Write a protein that binds this ligand. Sequence first.
Ligand SMILES: [Cl-]
Ligand SMILES: [Cl-]
Ligand SMILES: [Cl-]
Ligand SMILES: [Cl-]
Ligand SMILES: [Cl-]
Ligand SMILES: [Cl-]
Ligand SMILES: [Cl-]
Ligand code: NA
Ligand code: NA
Lengths: 226, 228
Amino acid sequence: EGGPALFQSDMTFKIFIDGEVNGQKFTIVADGSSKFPHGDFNAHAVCETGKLPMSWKPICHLIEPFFARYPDGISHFAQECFPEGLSIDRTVRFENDGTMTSHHTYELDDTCVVSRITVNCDGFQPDGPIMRDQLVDILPNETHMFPHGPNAVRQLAFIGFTTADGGLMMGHFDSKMTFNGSRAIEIPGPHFVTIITKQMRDTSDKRDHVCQREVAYAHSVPRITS
Amino acid sequence: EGGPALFQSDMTFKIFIDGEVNGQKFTIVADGSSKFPHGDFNAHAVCETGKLPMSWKPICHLIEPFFARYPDGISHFAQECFPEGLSIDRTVRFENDGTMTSHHTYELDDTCVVSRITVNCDGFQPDGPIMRDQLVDILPNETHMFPHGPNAVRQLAFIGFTTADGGLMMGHFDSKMTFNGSRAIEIPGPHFVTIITKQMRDTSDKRDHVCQREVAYAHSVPRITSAI
Ligand SMILES: [Cl-]
Ligand SMILES: [Cl-]
Ligand SMILES: [Cl-]
Ligand SMILES: [Cl-]
Ligand SMILES: [Cl-]
Ligand SMILES: [Cl-]
Ligand SMILES: [Cl-]
Ligand code: NA
Ligand code: NA
């Protein structure tokens, strides 16, 4: 049948990101695979238009929620959306800096998931650490998942980036995942997805290449009285 | 001799909250105890001024980070701040509703910690579930702890409140904890404090009485250090 049964195989993915920042256009293409049982996977991304005009760091979350590792007591909404598919409407607001707004669609073709993302990054500080490429690491974080009506789940996160000058650049992440289909789908109750990410420069062309690894797994926390 | 050493026994605390919401003043007083190794404690709170003019739920975080339970390998800043103590500046912004800003000061006296808090709850919706007292549960959540430069730690949280409708009202919690002393205090690496909270009514004669339990413990998530 559908949902998690479609993810019971090694999978591949391809992502096409159509973006702009402060009016400068860019294109990123990324691909990779995720081996069953998922939860730990790599992606290789390339800026097709040459040099990325901003830090690659804030792009980390654009470069597959359905590859997170879930325990059986929590419905894995992102996988349950297949085969009809998944759309995401996401905004990351960077403190003292710009806002990135992304619209994602995800389609499954046999064992390859194709992603299309359009992203607008508005109001980024030309002399800030994103535009000057001064972000170094991405902090592991405990994203919060909430039910959001009949066919959607909301993921809220605090994503901190360490910077060359020691202060954190904090992103406020707010992401609505919506099922493309019309059957009833199980909506998980409140829970958490732990996300650990690392991005590394790859040998660079006339184009920026980056390799990225992500570890992602869900858990819950029981209520009182206990 | 200072810091965590001062939390190796059972302790008590006492809290004075001087508040208002959309003009209306209120005062709360609360106390309780926390027994070693901490991480699970109750507070009894009373609105001295009569009936609380809003839901008690949003007050949960006003009514003791030094009583969270930490494992060995994460520095416990809120305890590390003693004997000199610490202050907090905190904003909770509620979606489609008001914002509460508070300023807390903590002082140790033997094995009691005293807290004084002023809080302004501005812009709350008269028709909303906070003012109309329609919030029922407080969702357990994974608060994020970050070093915040010399002498300070930042705690960020998404704190959901289930409404009577069976909907959700999200508070965006942003809290700065600052050491009040003058020596060179260490600051913890990024980590999390899991917080589970339950409020329960006590029979209100003259004044609103609320009893609140909290489970709070820290953990860290390691970063990837291998290449590829
Ligand atoms: Cl351009
Ligand atoms: Cl590629
Ligand atoms: Cl700046
Ligand atoms: Cl690198
Ligand atoms: Cl709002
Ligand atoms: Cl831990
Ligand atoms: Cl790891
Ligand atoms: Na949008
Ligand atoms: Na939209």
